[PDB]
């Protein structure tokens, strides 16, 4: 089997991407944030505290003839950015782009943090990291991909995120028309539960490539590119007037600037992030200070190849017995 679904930016900045997902019988379609940095499929629901729901579409398990309470199971997650949610668990039928999993754990939120409430466009998350990170207790549950894998034509999914445009998540096949040149594959460590890999270096603009190992994760659920302070300083030093602002919480730059590209290495291959992808616009409406899309990972504890980086590539998440990651230009 295979599946193919379009993923759409939630706003004009590509802060996140939403993908329609069918849950239950008859189908209830919710727009979920596919997150290769976490491993829980959770939704706003009829059980979510009413004051914490503001415009989201909810899953109502009582209206699904295939929903079953997973008795005694609870979940609770805290994300790197400080947001969180928790609740109980149902199993139900879940379909993405024509690919159907029966008995998928659907984690129903009883509580969500303010950032989730305030984002009316995101009805929940669909985790695509390794199932070892799943938070359901006392019986850990599998991700949608893990459940689908055996049925898929090939045990892979691909992320093809757009810059200010829709893109695609495919399951079970590699669309050879969706990228240019070749896909370069690179080793993955699953030791921390992430799609963790080592980039071979970077360049700023038309500058020379610096060969240096940068361990990090491919994370579709993180907006920005978070890299070591040395690398980030070298990038922003090429932008007149750019500075790290403790009050804003990262690098800002004059909105009048033209940003240089940023290149990262994948083995001997190179992925170029155009300068415009690094512009996240005014820090507040009407400001001439703009927020940068490349930020320091210092104090996160891990480097994160988030959407800024991934949307410059066609990315293969190869879930074979020994997982790997593939990157192609597009």
Swiss-Prot record:
Q: Which biological process terms from the Gene Ontology are attached to this UniProt entry?
A: proteolysis
Q: Which UniProt keywords apply?
A: Aspartyl protease, Disulfide bond, Hydrolase, Protease, Signal, Zymogen
Instruction: Name the active site residues.
Output: 35, 199
Q: List the disulfide bonds.
A: 255-290
Its UniProt entry gives the catalysed reaction(s) as: Hydrolysis of proteins with specificity similar to that of pepsin A, prefers hydrophobic residues at P1 and P1', but does not cleave 14-Ala-|-Leu-15 in the B chain of insulin or Z-Glu-Tyr. Clots milk
Peptidase A1 domain location: 17-328
Q: What is this protein called?
A: Endothiapepsin
Identify the taxonomic lineage of the organism of origin.
Answer: Eukaryota, Fungi, Dikarya, Ascomycota, Pezizomycotina
């Amino acid at each position: 089997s295979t599946g193919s679904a379009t993923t759409t930016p939630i706003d004009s900045l590509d802060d996140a991407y939403i993908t329609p997902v069918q849950i239950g019988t008859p189908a209830q379609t919710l727009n979920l944030d596919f997150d290769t940095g976490s491993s829980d499929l959770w939704v706003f629901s009829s059980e979510t505290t009413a004051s914490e729901v503001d415009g989201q579409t909810i899953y109502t398990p009582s209206k699904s003839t295939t929903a079953k309470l997973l008795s005694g199971a609870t979940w609770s997650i805290s994300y790197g950015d400080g947001s969180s949610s928790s609740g109980d668990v149902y199993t139900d039928t879940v379909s993405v782009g024509g690919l159907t999993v029966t008995g998928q754990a659907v984690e129903s939120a009883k509580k969500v943090s303010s950032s989730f409430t305030e984002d009316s466009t995101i009805d929940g998350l669909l985790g695509l990291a390794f199932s070892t990170l799943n938070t359901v207790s006392p019986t850990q549950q599998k991700t949608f991909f893990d459940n689908a894998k055996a049925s898929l034509d090939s045990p892979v999914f691909t992320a093809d995120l757009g810059y200010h445009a829709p893109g695609t998540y495919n399951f079970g096949f590699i669309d050879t028309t969706a990228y240019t040149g070749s896909i370069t594959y690179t080793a993955v460590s699953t030791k921390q539960g992430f799609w963790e890999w080592t980039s071979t270096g970077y360049a700023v603009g038309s500058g020379t490539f610096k060969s240096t190992s940068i361990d990090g994760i491919a994370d579709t659920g993180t907006t920005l590119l978070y890299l070591p302070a040395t690398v980030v300083s070298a990038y922003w030093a090429q932008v007149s007037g750019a500075k790290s602002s403790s009050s804003v919480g990262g690098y800002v730059f004059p909105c009048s600037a033209t940003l240089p590209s940023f290149t990262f290495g994948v083995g001997s291959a190179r992925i170029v992030i155009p300068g415009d992808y690094i512009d996240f616009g005014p820090i507040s409406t009407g400001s001439s200070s703009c927020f940068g899309g490349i930020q320091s990972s210092a104090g996160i504890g891990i480097n994160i190849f988030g959407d800024v980086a991934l949307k410059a590539a066609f990315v293969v998440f190869n879930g074979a017995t020994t997982p790997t990651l593939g990157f192609a230009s597009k």
